């Protein structure tokens with residue numbers, strides 16, 4: 575199985591214990607570590623944070639301890655305008671300038687591949703994403719001729735049917751990618767005007783939940799569109815999503831006034847790291863969605879959908895049963911990477927839980 579794990583460069587800036595440098599990463603934890611995100615500047619791949627050349631070195635030096643570990647650099651992300659990516663991909667000359675820039679930058683910095691994280695292509699973009707994947711792969715096949723192991727090429731693909739349909743020609747892009755990480759953890763958000771889970775495995779029955787907004791639908795759809803199971807990696811979050819309640823109701827369809835209050839460390843309304851969630855659960859009421867197979871918790875006027883050891887283990891069992899290529903984790907710096915918050919004295923509890931199941935029958 576693959577265990578694809580994202581590291582985010584902006585985690586460095588979180589205060590105190592929240593602060594995450596790549597030497598926090600267990601070199602034998604994941605099969606692949608993906609550093610997020612690279613810029614595109616002057617129509618070439620480029621660094622984003624001021625100290626990225628040092629952080630890339632600190633990540634890549636993990637390979638002296640686990641020579642089999644693979645690293646990738648993810649280009650794009652949500653602070654990169656989809657429109658910016660569209661302009662580069664849609665023109666022959668800019669596309670080529672970008673593609674030619676990628677192997678030398680990855681080699682200089684010690685990366686084994688590129689992850690494409692265009693978030694996300696519009697309807698007019700779908701044909702250009704296809705060309706970009708094809709031509710990037712062709713360039714990596716050519717660069718391999720000079721004697722180094724061929725660069726890997728992956729992509730991060732949203733799991734909502736509507737975004738898949740708009741932006742992605744899954745049958746074609748899957749031919750050229752080494753793996754696709756399916757982003758099966760964005761199925762609910764404050765835009766809705768109720769509580770709900772963002773990473774359910776299956777639909778809620780009871781009495782209100784749409785049939786596409788779950789991981790099983792998205793996996794099945796990707797496979798039906800032509801993505802081979804041996805290229806499909808299912809995303810599992812280590813973060814949870816928070817809401818502010820509009821009433822005393824906390825169950826299904828409970829109204830919300832907006833995102834939850836920021837976490838002490840992550841400092842973003844609507845999202846909490848798992849280490850923050852472990853702390854939140856002190857004094858909280860916990861519940862599970864029985865059909866969806868994922869938990870939530872509530873204290874005061876705050877309501878949190880999250881994943882725990884049990885839920886990620888159950889997701890890992892699913893993807894094994896479906897003969898998928900493995901799991902992706904978003905993100906290492908959102909798991910309890912210190913191992914001190916969740917009462918287990920265990921670094922990376924959720925990632926380790928996943929790995930424990932992938933290393934079983």
Ligand SMILES: *[C@@H]1O[C@H](CO)[C@@H](O[C@@H]2O[C@H](CO)[C@@H](O)[C@H](O)[C@H]2NC(C)=O)[C@H](O)[C@H]1NC(C)=O
Pocket residue numbers: 613614615616621622623
């Ligand atoms: C990412 O690359 C963009 C593209 O070059 C950078 O945006 C440019 O930055 C310079 C200096 O601020 C500006 O003059 C350009 O006009 C910007 N162009 C555009 C299209 O925005 C951006 O600063 C880079 N991002 C980071 C984090 O390095």
